[PDB]
Design a protein around this ligand. Sequence first.
Ligand SMILES: O=P(O)(O)[C@H](O)c1cccc2ccccc12
Length: 106
Amino acid sequence: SIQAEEWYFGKITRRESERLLLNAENPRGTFLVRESETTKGAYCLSVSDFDNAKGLNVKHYKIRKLDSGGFYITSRTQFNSLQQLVAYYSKHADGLCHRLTTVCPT
Ligand SMILES: O=P(O)(O)[C@H](O)c1cccc2ccccc12
């Protein structure tokens, strides 16, 4: 759980996530989950996007974790695990820049 997850990069900075995601070869939705730099207990979901307006770019979303157990970006849409959250957002874009597609290559 989490650390076993290949999309879990653990303790890497926001800048490092952008370095990895800003690769021209990455299609929209390339992603990774990492620790937040300053929000304790929260993780960050970093996602690549692309459009003709900005071109290749990166968005960061905070994944909150309750002691009650749930994981969520928006409190209205919660999951029993980080894994289920990733699987859901791989199917639904909802408010994200793109549905999660491919785990970010190192
Ligand atoms: O700096 P990170 O790691 O991206 C971090 O989780 C973060 C992202 C976006 C806004 C933030 C605001 C406050 C504290 C941390 C924040």
